[PDB]
Design an enzyme around this catalytic site. Structure first.
Site, short mmCIF file in Angstrom:
data_model
loop_
_atom_site.label_atom_id
_atom_site.label_comp_id
_atom_site.label_asym_id
_atom_site.label_seq_id
_atom_site.Cartn_x
_atom_site.Cartn_y
_atom_site.Cartn_z
N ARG A 59 63.61 50.27 47.19
CA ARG A 59 63.75 51.18 48.33
C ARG A 59 65.06 50.91 49.05
O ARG A 59 65.65 49.83 48.96
CB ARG A 59 62.57 51.02 49.29
CG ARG A 59 61.31 51.72 48.84
CD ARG A 59 60.13 51.48 49.81
NE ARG A 59 59.83 50.05 49.91
CZ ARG A 59 60.27 49.24 50.86
NH1 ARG A 59 61.03 49.70 51.86
NH2 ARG A 59 59.93 47.96 50.83
N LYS A 207 56.39 56.30 48.78
CA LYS A 207 56.37 55.61 50.05
C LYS A 207 56.85 56.50 51.21
O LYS A 207 56.56 56.20 52.38
CB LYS A 207 57.19 54.32 49.95
CG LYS A 207 56.68 53.27 48.91
CD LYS A 207 55.21 52.89 49.13
CE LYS A 207 54.79 51.68 48.26
NZ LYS A 207 53.43 51.21 48.71
N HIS A 226 47.42 49.02 54.47
CA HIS A 226 48.04 48.56 53.23
C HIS A 226 47.13 47.48 52.67
O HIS A 226 47.28 46.30 52.98
CB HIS A 226 49.43 48.02 53.50
CG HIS A 226 50.15 47.54 52.28
ND1 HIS A 226 50.30 48.31 51.15
CD2 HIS A 226 50.81 46.38 52.03
CE1 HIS A 226 50.99 47.63 50.24
NE2 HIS A 226 51.31 46.45 50.75
N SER A 244 52.48 39.48 49.16
CA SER A 244 52.58 39.08 47.77
C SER A 244 52.30 37.59 47.62
O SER A 244 52.70 36.77 48.45
CB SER A 244 53.97 39.41 47.22
OG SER A 244 54.16 40.81 47.19
N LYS A 248 45.69 38.88 46.44
CA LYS A 248 45.03 40.16 46.75
C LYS A 248 44.51 40.85 45.49
O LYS A 248 43.35 41.26 45.43
CB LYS A 248 46.00 41.07 47.51
CG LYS A 248 45.42 42.48 47.79
CD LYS A 248 46.25 43.29 48.81
CE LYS A 248 47.58 43.69 48.29
NZ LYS A 248 48.39 44.33 49.37
N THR A 249 45.37 41.00 44.48
CA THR A 249 44.94 41.70 43.27
C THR A 249 43.80 40.95 42.57
O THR A 249 42.77 41.55 42.23
CB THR A 249 46.13 41.90 42.33
OG1 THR A 249 47.15 42.65 43.00
CG2 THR A 249 45.69 42.67 41.08
N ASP A 263 46.66 49.95 46.85
CA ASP A 263 47.91 49.99 47.63
C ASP A 263 47.70 50.46 49.07
O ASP A 263 47.90 49.67 50.00
CB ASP A 263 48.92 50.88 46.91
CG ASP A 263 50.28 50.87 47.59
OD1 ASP A 263 50.73 49.79 47.99
OD2 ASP A 263 50.90 51.95 47.68
N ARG A 327 58.90 48.23 37.12
CA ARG A 327 57.66 48.88 37.52
C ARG A 327 57.10 49.72 36.38
O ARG A 327 57.79 50.10 35.44
CB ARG A 327 57.88 49.82 38.71
CG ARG A 327 58.38 49.14 39.97
CD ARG A 327 57.21 48.69 40.80
NE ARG A 327 57.65 47.93 41.97
CZ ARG A 327 56.93 47.77 43.06
NH1 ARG A 327 55.70 48.29 43.16
NH2 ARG A 327 57.43 47.05 44.05
#
Length: 527
Positions: A59, A207, A226, A244, A248-249, A263, A327
Site C-alpha cells: 500500500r 483496503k 480487523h 502479525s 491469530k490465523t 480479515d 500475495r
C-alpha cells in the site's frame, strides 16, 4: 449493463464492456497475447495465474487522500488535526475533479471490465460497489475479494460506491497541487467514489472499501473489526484480534469451528458479517506442510501477485527478491471449513485479543473489564525480541474515524451480546521462552466453552488483570506471570517498563473524552 451507464461517471467512447465476467472468461483474458507490461499474466503449475505489480508491492499511505468537504469536514479523522498521526490527508474538491478526470480519460476509448459486487455479507447493511478497470486481472482481483452477486441480485443492482482503477495513468501536476507523488489513492464521500492512479498493488482495491466501510459503519452504530471470526457447532461466535505473529490465523483455525472470515468484519443488529468474499493471503515462505489450507487454495481462479515464477512454470514461494509481501487472492470457498452459503453469523460472545509479549510480563490469559477492553483494543500491543509495536484497533492504517469511536461501538455491541473479552499472551514468559502452542490452544478451548466467564480469579498488580485461579488442561503454575521470575520484584521491574510504554503510547488518544477517560483504566506504575 450498457455503455451509456458508464457515461454517468465521465467515461466516454467505450469500445466494449465485459460485465461481471466468469472465472473462465477471466482466465482466457489474462493470457491474451497482446497484453503488455504489468497487464501480463502467466499460468503456474498449481493452476493459478500469476501477475506482477511493478514497483508498488504494498500500500501507498503517503499517496492516500480524502476530499475534505461538507460530508467529511467534521466527521473524518484528519491527518492535520489532533494528537494522533495518520495518513488521512485532506484533498481539495478541485484537485479531486482533476484526479477523477485523469482516471476517467484513461478509461475512455477502451475495452472495460465492470464488476458489480458487495462489501459486507449482511444484505441490510452491505455496500453495493461497482468496480471499473481496463485490466482483466484487476477485475479478477475484485471478483475474488468482494462478495459475488447472484444473477438475480445483479438485476436490481444499484451502486452505492464506484471504484475506478486507473493504474496506467499518473498525475503530472502533482507537485504544484501539493501532493506526495504522481500516484494517488483518492476518496470522495460526497460522490462516493475511489480513484486509483499509478499504483498496481492489488490491495488498494480491497483496503479502499475497508476504509470507507470503516467510515460509514460506526456512524450508523455498526462495529468494524480487523479480526478473524469463527463459529462453533452451537452457533457461538468468537472474534480474534492480533497483530502479525500473535497466532491469530492458527488459533482461529479449528476443525470444529467454521470460519466466517480472516480479515475484516462488521457487527450490526443481526451479528457478525465478513466484509469480503475472498482472502488476500501472504505467501512468502509458503509450504504445503506449514499452511496446507492456503496452499490448497492456490489453484485455478486464485491470483498470485509478485511471486517468483520459474522458467518451467513452478513457483519459488521462498523468493522475496522482488518483495517479502508476495500475495495470493482467492474466493473464500477455496477454503473448505467456512460458514456458507453466507459469510455471517450471530453475535460474538467471546472476544480474544492476542499479543506476543516479548517482555514476558502479561499472563497467558486474563479476563478484561469493559474499560480494559477499550484500552487494550486502542493499544493494539505486541512485541518481538524486546521491541514493542502498538497499532490502534489492531490496524491503524484503515481507520477513517478516531480510534476511540471504534472502541466505543465494539464494546456497545459486546455489552448487548453479553460478550466477554480475554487478553491472551502467546509470546514469552519470565524464562525467556515462548508459551507453548499446546498451552494457548487449551486456553482458547477454555475461553470458548464459557468456563472462564464466571470463574474465580486473582488480580495481577499494576495491570489489574483478572487471572483464573485454575484452568482445565493447563499447568496452573503458568497462569501467574510472576512465577517464571526469580522473585516478584524481578517481574515488577519489567512490568513497570511495559506499563510506561502503554501509558506513553495511549497519550495520543486523550484529545477525545473517550480516550481521556480511559487513562484511569490503563496500567498503573508502581507507587
Amino acid at each position: 449493463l450498457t455503455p451509456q451507464e458508464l457515461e454517468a461517471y465521465g467515461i466516454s467512447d467505450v469500445h466494449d464492456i465485459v460485465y461481471n465476467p466468469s472465472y473462465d472468461l477471466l482466465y482466457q483474458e489474462e493470457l491474451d497475447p497482446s497484453l503488455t507490461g504489468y497487464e501480463r499474466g502467466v499460468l503456474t503449475n498449481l493452476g493459478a495465474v500469476a501477475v506482477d505489480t511493478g514497483i508498488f508491492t504494498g500500500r501507498s499511505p503517503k499517496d492516500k487522500y480524502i476530499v475534505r468537504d461538507d460530508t467529511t469536514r467534521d466527521t473524518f479523522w484528519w491527518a492535520d488535526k489532533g494528537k494522533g498521526k495518520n495518513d488521512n490527508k485532506p484533498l481539495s474538491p478541485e484537485t479531486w475533479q482533476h484526479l477523477k478526470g485523469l482516471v476517467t480519460r484513461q478509461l475512455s476509448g477502451k475495452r472495460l471490465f465492470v464488476v458489480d459486487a458487495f462489501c459486507g455479507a449482511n444484505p441490510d447493511t452491505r455496500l453495493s460497489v461497482r468496480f471499473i478497470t481496463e485490466v482483466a486481472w484487476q477485475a479478477h482481483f475484485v471478483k475474488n475479494m468482494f462478495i459475488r452477486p447472484s444473477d438475480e441480485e445483479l438485476a436490481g443492482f444499484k451502486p452505492d460506491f464506484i471504484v475506478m482503477n486507473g493504474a496506467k495513468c499518473t498525475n503530472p501536476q502533482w507537485k504544484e497541487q501539493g501532493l506526495n507523488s504522481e500516484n494517488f489513492v483518492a476518496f470522495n464521500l460526497t460522490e462516493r467514489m475511489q480513484l486509483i492512479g499509478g499504483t498496481w498493488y492489488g490491495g488498494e482495491m480491497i483496503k479502499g472499501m475497508v476504509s470507507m466501510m470503516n467510515y460509514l459503519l460506526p456512524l450508523k452504530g455498526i462495529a468494524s473489526m480487523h479480526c478473524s471470526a469463527n463459529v462453533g457447532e452451537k452457533g457461538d461466535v468468537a472474534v480474534f484480534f492480533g497483530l502479525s505473529g500473535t497466532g491469530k490465523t492458527t488459533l482461529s483455525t479449528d476443525p470444529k469451528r467454521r470460519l466466517i472470515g480472516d480479515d475484516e468484519h462488521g457487527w450490526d443488529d443481526d451479528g457478525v458479517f465478513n466484509f469480503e468474499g475472498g482472502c488476500y493471503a501472504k505467501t512468502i515462505k509458503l509450504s504445503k506442510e506449514a499452511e496446507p489450507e492456503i496452499y490448497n487454495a492456490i489453484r485455478r481462479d486464485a491470483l498470485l501477485e509478485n511471486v517468483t515464477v520459474r522458467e518451467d512454470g513452478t513457483i519459488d514461494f521462498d523468493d522475496g527478491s522482488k518483495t517479502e509481501n508476495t500475495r495470493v487472492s482467492y474466493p473464500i470457498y477455496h477454503i473448505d471449513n467456512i460458514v456458507k452459503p453466507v459469510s455471517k453469523a450471530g453475535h460474538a460472545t467471546k472476544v480474544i485479543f492476542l499479543t506476543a509479549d516479548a517482555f514476558g510480563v502479561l499472563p497467558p490469559v486474563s479476563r478484561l473489564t469493559a474499560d480494559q477492553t477499550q484500552y487494550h483494543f486502542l493499544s493494539g500491543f505486541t512485541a518481538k525480541l524486546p521491541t514493542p509495536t502498538f497499532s490502534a484497533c489492531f490496524g491503524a492504517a484503515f481507520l477513517s474515524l478516531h480510534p476511540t469511536q471504534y472502541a466505543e461501538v465494539l464494546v456497545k455491541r459486546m455489552q448487548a451480546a453479553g460478550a466477554q473479552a480475554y487478553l491472551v499472551n502467546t509470546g514469552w514468559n519470565g524464562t525467556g521462552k515462548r508459551i507453548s502452542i499446546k498451552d494457548t490452544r487449551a486456553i482458547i478451548d477454555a475461553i470458548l466453552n464459557g468456563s472462564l466467564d464466571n470463574a474465580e480469579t486473582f488480580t495481577l498488580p499494576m495491570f489489574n488483570l483478572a487471572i483464573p485461579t485454575e484452568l482445565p488442561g493447563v499447568d496452573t503454575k503458568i497462569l501467574d506471570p510472576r512465577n517464571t521470575y526469580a522473585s516478584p520484584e524481578q517481574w515488577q521491574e519489567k512490568a513497570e517498563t511495559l506499563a510506561k510504554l502503554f501509558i506513553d503510547n495511549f497519550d495520543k488518544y486523550t484529545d477525545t473524552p473517550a480516550g481521556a477517560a480511559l487513562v484511569a483504566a490503563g496500567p498503573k506504575l508502581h507507587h
